[PDB]
Amino acid sequence: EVGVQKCKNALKLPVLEVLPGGGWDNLRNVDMGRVMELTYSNCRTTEDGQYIIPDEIFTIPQKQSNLEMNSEILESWANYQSSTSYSINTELSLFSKVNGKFSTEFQRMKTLQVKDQAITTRVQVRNLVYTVKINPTLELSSGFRKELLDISDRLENNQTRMATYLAELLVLNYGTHVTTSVDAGAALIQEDHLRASFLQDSSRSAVTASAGLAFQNTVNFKFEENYTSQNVLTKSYLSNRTNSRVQSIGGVPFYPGITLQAWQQGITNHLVAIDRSGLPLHFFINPNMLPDLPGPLVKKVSKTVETAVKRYYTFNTYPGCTDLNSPNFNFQANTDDGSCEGKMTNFSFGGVYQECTQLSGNRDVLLCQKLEQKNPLTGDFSHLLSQIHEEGYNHLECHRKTVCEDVFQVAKAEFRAFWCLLFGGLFSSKSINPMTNAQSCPAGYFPLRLFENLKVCVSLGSRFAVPFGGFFSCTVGNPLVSLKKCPGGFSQHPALISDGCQVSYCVKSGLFTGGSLPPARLPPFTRPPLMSQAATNTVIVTNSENARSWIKDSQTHQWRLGEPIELRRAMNVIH
Amino acid sequence: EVGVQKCKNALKLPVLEVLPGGGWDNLRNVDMGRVMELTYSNCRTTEDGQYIIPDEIFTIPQKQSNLEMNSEILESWANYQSSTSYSINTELSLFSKVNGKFSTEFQRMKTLQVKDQAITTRVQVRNLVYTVKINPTLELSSGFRKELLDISDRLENNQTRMATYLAELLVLNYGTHVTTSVDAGAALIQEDHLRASFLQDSSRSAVTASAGLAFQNTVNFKFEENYTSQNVLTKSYLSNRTNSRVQSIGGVPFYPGITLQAWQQGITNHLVAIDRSGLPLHFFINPNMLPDLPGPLVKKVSKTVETAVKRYYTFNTYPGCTDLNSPNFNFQANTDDGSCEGKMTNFSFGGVYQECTQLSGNRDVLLCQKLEQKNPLTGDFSHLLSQIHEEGYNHLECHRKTVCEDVFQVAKAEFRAFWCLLFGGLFSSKSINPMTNAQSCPAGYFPLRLFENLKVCVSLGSRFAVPFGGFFSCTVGNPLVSLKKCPGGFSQHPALISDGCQVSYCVKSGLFTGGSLPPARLPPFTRPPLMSQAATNTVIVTNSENARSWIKDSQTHQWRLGEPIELRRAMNVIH
Amino acid sequence: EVGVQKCKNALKLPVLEVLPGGGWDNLRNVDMGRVMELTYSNCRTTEDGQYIIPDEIFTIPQKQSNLEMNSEILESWANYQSSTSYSINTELSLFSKVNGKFSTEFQRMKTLQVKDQAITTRVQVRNLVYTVKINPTLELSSGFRKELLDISDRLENNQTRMATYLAELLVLNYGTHVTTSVDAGAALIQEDHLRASFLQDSSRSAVTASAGLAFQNTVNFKFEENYTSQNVLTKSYLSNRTNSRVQSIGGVPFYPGITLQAWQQGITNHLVAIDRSGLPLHFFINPNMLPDLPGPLVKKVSKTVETAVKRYYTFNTYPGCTDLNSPNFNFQANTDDGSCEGKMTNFSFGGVYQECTQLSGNRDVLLCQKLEQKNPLTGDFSHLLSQIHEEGYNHLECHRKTVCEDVFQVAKAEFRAFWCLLFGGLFSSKSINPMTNAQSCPAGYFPLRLFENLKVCVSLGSRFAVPFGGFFSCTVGNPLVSLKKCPGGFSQHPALISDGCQVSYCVKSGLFTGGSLPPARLPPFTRPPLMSQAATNTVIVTNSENARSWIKDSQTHQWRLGEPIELRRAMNVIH
Ligand SMILES: *[C@@H]1O[C@H](CO)[C@@H](O[C@@H]2O[C@H](CO)[C@@H](O)[C@H](O)[C@H]2NC(C)=O)[C@H](O)[C@H]1NC(C)=O
Ligand SMILES: *[C@@H]1O[C@H](CO)[C@@H](O[C@@H]2O[C@H](CO)[C@@H](O)[C@H](O)[C@H]2NC(C)=O)[C@H](O)[C@H]1NC(C)=O
Ligand SMILES: *[C@@H]1O[C@H](CO)[C@@H](O[C@@H]2O[C@H](CO)[C@@H](O)[C@H](O)[C@H]2NC(C)=O)[C@H](O)[C@H]1NC(C)=O
Ligand SMILES: *[C@@H]1O[C@H](CO)[C@@H](O)[C@H](O)[C@H]1NC(C)=O
Ligand SMILES: *[C@@H]1O[C@H](CO)[C@@H](O)[C@H](O)[C@H]1NC(C)=O
Ligand SMILES: *[C@@H]1O[C@H](CO)[C@@H](O)[C@H](O)[C@H]1NC(C)=O
């Protein structure tokens, strides 16, 4: 009797199930949580009277049905076209070559093209019924507004490591984009994979017309073979096809033999999104959407969320060779590198060493064990990055009467990795060693620990040997090519992202390259901080350019614009 | 019981779903938000008693059904005819060659004509049921009126950078035009693509009559082949066709085998817009639509919105070669240039350099790093534009008792780009480098940063080398052709629109040209300003020519016409 | 009238049976108990109005139907793809090669590939109807919250052995993961096993197209043979197939002859989970989910549960040879080792001996019997690990009047195992001796007890002799290869996990290898402790870095933030 069911009891007609305002992960092409609030307290319908819609949603009747007679030809996976989220992937961004490269649809097409040198053809029927958009005047959802205020509280109390962590949880829960418009409808798609040698034989206009005719035979005729696309060209066509599937998106489920008439009757009340557009997530963090906060404080929240989205694109970028016919083809690479024609020069190094340094003298945990490692061939330790490894421990003291008390300290320790035998190559915790596919070293190799969770397999051992190309990081390059990329003929691979620092290495294995595609490193990219910083309660927020000031009322009820008498009355206890 | 549902419960008949008064993007041909207010508080219907309409909408019964026997022939994509928004694209404007050039329908026709040298034919059935118009006496919507008052407030407080930003958000949300009349109906269209060599063979009257006959075979007969357009001419016709599709726009969804009788029965209650006319968005910003504002103040708001629409057309204009048979054909060019017959002269330059200058001496951010770059071949830095790069930072001081306070400053910095090796060529953030299609430099090339987010790949490296043609901007041309265009044989490409300043460059690659079509740079074209200006509260608005004056009542309730006693009583505290 | 049935009586429509928020065992791929709370006190439905859902669950309408024409080919069991829990097995973890390796589906595929050198093909129809996710703002279930507070109470009272035991009961009841999203739908799968020699014969595209055609003959046609996939290729295909099954997952039960039309009608109200994603179990133990506990205390609970999950993966990891064509293939090994090419060197040892040491002088139990064993060939006892064997006993004293009293002591005893004849080899309690498959020694062999429940069969006896490779443990390696792995040509086998210490041994039998697959060692891996430690009641919890403190109110009602007056008032009785 309140909200959705009040409309449904009064009107007796369904609710439109394709709605914008939700979050969107633009790498995986999945829907990620509700950013905007959608309330039903006006009983609004679409103007044809078919669907209940939210009060702040307007629809545009398209009623458009497209029917193709020819299949398209998609030449390569690098220029990927989604067919269900095409508008939001190809937006103007500095990340356009990574969008949609971790979706289930893309992983299947990249596998099938590389595995048996195939090109993909697509023919489809497409029904666009409504375009569904948000109004510009629109409020945030309560769950999304609450998680933005928590990032604001951690930035006031100078808890930057905690605020960066909560921003990466926001990207995990709400994605990178917010959909502002969705195309509601249904589609029926056939996707074939043909040998690339069959293409280059005048050719293309006769192939694609037969693929579109075979598609209409598959839908209209039953599984008993009564087709009409059987001629001389099809006997070669059926033998060069390496894979074939039919998918329905919306409507009734497809089976071979449903007519195109009957599939188009079941589209009603089964609409899904077949296209969508949107804006980045930090666009909707501005003083208009968050009115009960100071001005420059929400631009600091929006800058934190924007940095978290940009890390999510950078940690999932794989530069490398992309040209399939060339040697040193990198199958895990989603971005080209220019290293297709690469001359390889072998060069070795002695070993890799570490040292450990404790800022706090600890008699409890003894962090120096299993953190420092010396060279096997030099004997002692003889820079990549510079970071601090903290750990919390517990004291527990009593006094007999028995009551007790426990204090929690933070044991700090600091390590330094360095480079300047037999390989290998390496494996971290979260990765495996593709020399063994086993998170272990081969026979005759002992692991060298170079980080907190990374092992390097180093020693008859020449049967497993792979070359080497250097290390680099997000701040330090390598001189082997102060530049980030590998030398030519080498492929780069991530190894133990630590505190938001991507450190990589270069090899010439060929077995680190092949295998399954990497499944999309998700935030958070840092362990939760140990809360090593005290809450510094800010009371006055101001900026010098506007001479505007914000003072919140005790005890932390609401922010409020200031008055120059109330400023210096509060600046006396502040300064 | 209030508004729409009060009419529907009383009358028991649907609402007309094709309504004017909404916003319209004339580049992409999409509907963009509601500009006019449409209320239903009279229960008005169309005069045939079929549809509920708004109170300020009048309809004209057309009841017109057009049935073509011959296909048209559309000769080229430059003279594009939309078939669903033809009247509003071809209006009298200074932008007529860019209208509709980013719509989904145009992108498909330009691709299919260029890819296999095709000409497009179109045959259609078209039902115009109503012409639906707005009355001249009409009010603005509440959401659109609210966003115009926010532009008025930023212009009163001398916040010009914020008012320009809010005007570009108005174009993003509400488009460039407002539809004043829409043609409600349904259409059934077949679009073929034939080889251009098949056209020039007496010919045209026999081709188009067979295409119109094949269209009526496709609709009337089932997918089982029982057609009557099978003769000697069709066997050549079926072999020169490169693509074919059938689309329905409104009505029931099309399938091959629905009769033309049956398709025309399902048009009722499924009407869509098949044509529309309209006026520019700034036409509706005038003292009659906004009565509760001063006179010259709304002409300042209308001039701001008009400038924002004109930037949206200018940033999406691509001059270049258009003649398909000529060399140096620019596939990304939507506007002709006159550089079809172009003689190429090679000429090099040494390098490109920058200097940085801080207006504020900052001991916190140190903007000089990663902003200045020197020449690799000269050693030191030895003009395109002149703009200021600002950045906000945060101080945080405490006093132990612990309360705190944080001030936000604006760190200003100013850079200068300059021109007067091996290429290349370049890539910005939001663009990629089409030498690699990868947002990266080729092998042997290191990036030269020339802007805040732009890289220029400059060094065996002659295998990737492309020529060079110069730089120019919206204020500074180049002498290589003080003129804006490229020299002959070169194509221009945008690179890092910065603060509303289009700066471009010229190349002779051939790989920067090809690829997918650019997807329509959308507003805002500037980052949000850092609010570096104080609110100057204007109280009296007047003009010298009329001697009329407007004084708003404290505290900022409403504007009001003035009296000469109340002027000098308020001019005493003003001057 | 309260909860679930209140919704069902009002709405008269079923409840969605595929819900996230439950626990998940990622080794066995089974559902393990309810972690999150799901309440129905809003009568929420899916937006198509088909299913009642919980109030903190949102669904995404997918309505997606995939229909494959070609079977896949899965090359080996090491790269296992689950087809029903594929997303949660292949997550980014340091355990990725053990996930799903104890599920019923994997045990069948690994058996059928090894037994008759087979490769597996899979073809499937797959209907994804909804994606069902949890909101980020979500509370824990009452049963799961109660078992986390019990781990908190044992850590306050310094009862670490009891808290480690209750953490392993949490993994047994609630699994290792929590599902955050489930794909609701139905699938119809055919899985064949073909001879691997039939694969390598152009070949793969004709095999998989016939397997997909035979699948559609099996579903559509009745058991009376009327198939259409009968040609020259199938007569070889039917003879190289070693096993074949059809499974339905969701929907109506499959029988040969149900049409694909009829199977897709019965999917409604019979949805199951066909994919799922999730996060580790210790991710949901944080101060936001448990608000009524101190800060650093729940990070100690989360570290205890994380250690228990990591033991569950480590005790079920079997390194060894994996290459099927090589000798010394280890059938029980689920993780590769690099010991495929291994040269075997025979070397013997004299014997194994033990000594016992009692820390408490006991005149009641006499633990020295059946705990110490000497060498048969040396005569006396002449280190693996160092652990204490405790035992509780009972006194019972009376005084005639007759009332009584019984005290429970803890008899401590400590044993030491050592190494430095004829085999063998050994058997523990929970294992058997695969030389006899009988938990007994062969003829001519007497058992040598090396642990509390382990026997070693050591002596005409050369007919049962197997070689030897050494012992090692989780802290002590062996020098025969201070390294953990076996020497080459040897396989490792677990033997009597004792107090969380995996101690293993190496053999070259070939009969310890073969047999059935090991059925997934489940927690707890330790007997319950004898409660040998007094409750040390902590009252004040604090940490030095934040200077925050928590004081619970007498008598142990609730925790509460502290005040500096109440600290030293409570630190007086504490110190
Ligand atoms: C893959 O396609 C090629 C064509 O590019 C096929 O080769 C032709 O097959 C037809 C079939 O009878 C022959 O008549 C031609 O002589 C073949 N050669 C050429 C150059 O056209 C090839 O057969 C296809 N692959 C398979 C496995 O059939
Ligand atoms: C494309 O169109 C041309 C005509 O412009 C076709 O060429 C003719 O095809 C017919 C078909 O039998 C022949 O009888 C003529 O002799 C051809 N030449 C001329 C000059 O008319 C051409 O065949 C078409 N393309 C394809 C692939 O069929
Ligand atoms: C297993 O597969 C092999 C093919 O790899 C079969 O061998 C062929 O069988 C056909 C059947 O008539 C013969 O015509 C061929 O001459 C055989 N050899 C080759 C090299 O193709 C084998 O028969 C299959 N196993 C069984 C038991 O039938
Ligand atoms: C804020 O945190 C930073 C973190 O390093 C620290 O350096 C700084 O001193 C802190 N400032 C205050 C006022 O607490
Ligand atoms: C806590 O338990 C450990 C277990 O060995 C013991 O060593 C320690 O003395 C105990 N501390 C207190 C305060 O009871
Ligand atoms: C308990 O029973 C045992 C049984 O043999 C006996 O030896 C012992 O004396 C009894 N103790 C008491 C206190 O009754």
Coordinates of C-alpha atoms and ligand atoms in Angstrom, one line a residue, chain C residues 197-198 201 235-236 239-240, ligand 3:
Chain C
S197 CA 44.1 -40.8 -30.1
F198 CA 40.8 -39.9 -31.9
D201 CA 43.9 -37.2 -36.8
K235 CA 30.7 -44.6 -36.9
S236 CA 34.2 -43.8 -35.8
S239 CA 33.5 -46.3 -31.2
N240 CA 36.0 -43.9 -29.6
Ligands
LIG3 C1 39.6 -44.7 -32.2 O1 39.9 -43.7 -33.2 C2 40.8 -44.2 -34.3 C3 41.1 -43.0 -35.1 O2 41.9 -42.0 -34.4 C4 40.1 -45.3 -35.1 O3 41.0 -45.8 -36.1 C5 40.3 -45.7 -37.4 O4 39.1 -46.3 -37.5 C6 38.4 -46.2 -38.8 C7 37.1 -46.9 -38.6 O5 36.8 -47.7 -39.8 C8 39.3 -46.8 -39.9 O6 38.7 -46.6 -41.1 C9 40.7 -46.2 -39.8 O7 41.5 -46.9 -40.8 C10 41.3 -46.3 -38.4 N1 42.6 -45.7 -38.4 C11 43.0 -44.4 -38.6 C12 44.4 -44.1 -38.5 O8 42.1 -43.5 -38.9 C13 39.8 -46.5 -34.1 O9 39.1 -47.5 -34.8 C14 38.9 -46.0 -32.9 N2 38.7 -47.1 -32.0 C15 37.8 -48.0 -32.1 C16 37.7 -49.0 -31.0 O10 37.0 -48.0 -33.0

